[PDB]
Write a protein that binds this ligand. Structure first.
Ligand SMILES: [Ca+2]
Ligand SMILES: [Ca+2]
Ligand SMILES: [Ca+2]
Ligand SMILES: [Zn+2]
Lengths: 532, 12, 21
């Protein structure tokens, strides 16, 4: 691959680069430096490449096409770059050329072929329909794909990938005015979407995730009005009747229940309060570690419960000694016992945690402090077991996440959003320091590699960049440094954070960033040299 | 939040 | 509410935070 060859001002050079280097090298443009993106995705390049793609798509004879896969990937890579790069912004004549190229592939006699080579190009075409803002333009095709799908198509990895892209189209259509204006009247689409979700042959099959996505997008259709409304309702009713909230088809049932509940009246479907009934069914084991920790789990062994409780129990005492808490909670905080909610797997977490705890689940778990002052507030850590998690509890991220509960109750006044200064360095650093103590090779490695952060930079860390190196490793390094070399300052900072004096907290660590930078650097040196 | 798709998962 | 799931979902991710109402 040679990414520089996409920067030429001649569109023929760029086309030659796409053809000769292929989709695997085009992948680089999604994350290339801005200079390359502004040059690769000139409006003229997008136009000329779409015009070439139109002619190639018209001639396509089935059986896949490495070149068309690369061309459509490039075009939607351009829309990705345009969305995230303020210096990439297409002129108004780009998208009609892209729409013409999608049209050429859609109108081809081979559009509905079932093969993995076809699926590879078809995938990039369907995603381009969303990336290019064309969600309103191919609803008959979405309908045909939903109705044509069967177990033969489902054998092919790249056909599953491609057709699953129609749910991305439905989802992205929410921001498309022509789509919103028309989707409520798409009665055939609604029927095909419902019947796709109802395919019994999807249960336990490689395409079950698609039927689940269909159930979700069907429930989302209740946010629109029009001649399709009664078909949407009928099909949702059949989903809720055919499947159950826990058991066969529950990914489909719960996918639909989530959007129905948010956008519609749960009582029109008989699914009100389903979240609390689901919780009792999925999280059916209860194991009380102590007055301050209780586990609710889906399917853990007794050995796992005992090991989780003793690991958290050890961290709990270590936290209280290290943070010099006196076991005195902050004021206005009645989160007296952490509830640790452990699902059997990442998949189970993705299926059940969302509705039970009203959270997004594209993550490795999370701690919900809630509002500690409200009577009835429940502090919930939501997690899952994994085979490569830590023995002997095998709960992913348990030891780190548990510290957020203790830091929240004993160090930081208020709910999660109460601070009016940045505190990510402390929150994440103390969770790493308490849970890992001095066993942190990754933290050493990020000093050794030559790229470092100052105290001042660490204190400004945010979740925005999602720089996990800066957040977790350098957060840990700064916390460990302050504990080992300046514990009295930490105790002084904690007087302010415990009371919610966030300005005093900031003024306090501002002093650290100027005074201690050079010692922080020597401390890193000693840490590296100890490793050798 | 709407976000345009990056890459699709390849076959293992 | 969630976006549709891709064919592959990562098991060993970092945590999130915030809203669970
Ligand atoms: Ca288990
Ligand atoms: Ca708190
Ligand atoms: Ca580094
Ligand atoms: Zn954390």
């Amino acid at each position: 691959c040679d990414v520089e060859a996409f920067t030429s001002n001649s569109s023929n050079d760029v086309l030659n680069a796409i053809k000769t280097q292929g989709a695997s090298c085009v992948n680089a443009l999604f994350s290339a430096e801005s200079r390359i993106q502004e040059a690769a995705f000139e409006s003229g390049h997008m136009y000329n490449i779409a015009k070439h793609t139109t002619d190639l798509a018209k001639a396509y004879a089935g059986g896949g096409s490495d070149e068309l896969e690369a061309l459509f990937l490039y075009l939607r890579a351009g829309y990705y770059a345009e969305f995230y790069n303020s210096k990439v912004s297409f002129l108004s004549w780009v998208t009609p050329a892209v729409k013409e190229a999608v049209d050429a592939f859609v109108n081809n006699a081979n559009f509905y072929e079932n093969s993995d080579p076809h699926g590879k190009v078809l995938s990039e075409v369907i995603i381009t329909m969303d990336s290019a803002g064309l969600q309103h333009a191919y609803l008959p095709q979405v309908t045909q794909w939903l109705t044509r799908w069967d177990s033969q198509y489902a054998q092919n990895w790249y056909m599953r990938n491609a057709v699953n892209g129609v749910f991305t189209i439905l989802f992205g259509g929410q921001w498309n005015e022509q789509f919103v204006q028309t989707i409520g009247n798409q009665t055939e689409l609604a029927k095909a979407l419902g019947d796709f979700a109802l395919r019994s042959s999807a249960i336990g099959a490689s395409d079950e995730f698609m039927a689940a996505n269909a159930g979700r997008e069907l429930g989302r259709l209740t946010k629109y009005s029009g001649s399709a409304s009664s078909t949407v309702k009928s099909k949702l009713t059949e989903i809720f009747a055919q499947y159950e909230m826990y058991g066969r088809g529950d990914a489909i049932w719960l996918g639909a229940a989530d959007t129905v509940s948010y956008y519609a009246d749960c009582s029109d479907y008989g699914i009100c309060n389903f979240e609390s009934q689901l919780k009792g069914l999925v999280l059916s084991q209860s194991y009380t570690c102590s007055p301050t920790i209780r586990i609710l789990s889906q399917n853990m062994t007794q050995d796992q419960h005992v090991a989780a409780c003793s690991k958290m129990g050890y961290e709990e005492g270590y936290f209280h000694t290290s943070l010099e808490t006196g076991r005195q909670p902050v004021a206005d905080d009645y989160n007296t016992q952490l509830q640790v909610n452990i699902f059997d797997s990442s998949d189970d977490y993705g299926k059940y945690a969302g509705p039970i705890f009203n959270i997004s689940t594209n993550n490795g778990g999370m701690y919900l402090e809630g509002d500690p002052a409200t009577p009835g507030n429940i502090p919930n850590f939501v997690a899952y077991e994994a085979p490569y998690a830590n023995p002997d509890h095998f709960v992913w991220n348990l030891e780190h996440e548990y510290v957020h509960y203790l830091d929240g109750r004993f160090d930081l006044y208020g709910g999660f959003g109460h601070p009016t200064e940045r505190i990510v360095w402390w929150s994440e650093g103390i969770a790493e320091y308490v849970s890992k103590e001095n066993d942190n090779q990754a933290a050493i490695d990020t000093i050794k590699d030559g790229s470092t952060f100052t105290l001042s930079e660490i204190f400004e860390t945010s979740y925005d960049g999602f720089d996990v190196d800066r957040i977790a490793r350098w957060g840990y390094l700064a916390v460990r440094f302050m504990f080992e070399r300046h514990k009295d300052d930490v105790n002084q900072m904690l007087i302010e954070t415990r009371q919610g004096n966030w300005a005093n907290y900031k003024a306090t660590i501002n002093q650290w960033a100027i005074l201690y930078q050079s010692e922080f650097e020597q401390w890193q040196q000693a840490l590296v040299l100890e490793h050798h | 939040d709407y976000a345009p798709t990056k890459l699709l998962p390849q076959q293992p | 509410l969630s976006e549709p799931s891709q064919q592959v979902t990562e098991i060993y991710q970092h945590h999130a935070h915030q809203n669970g109402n």
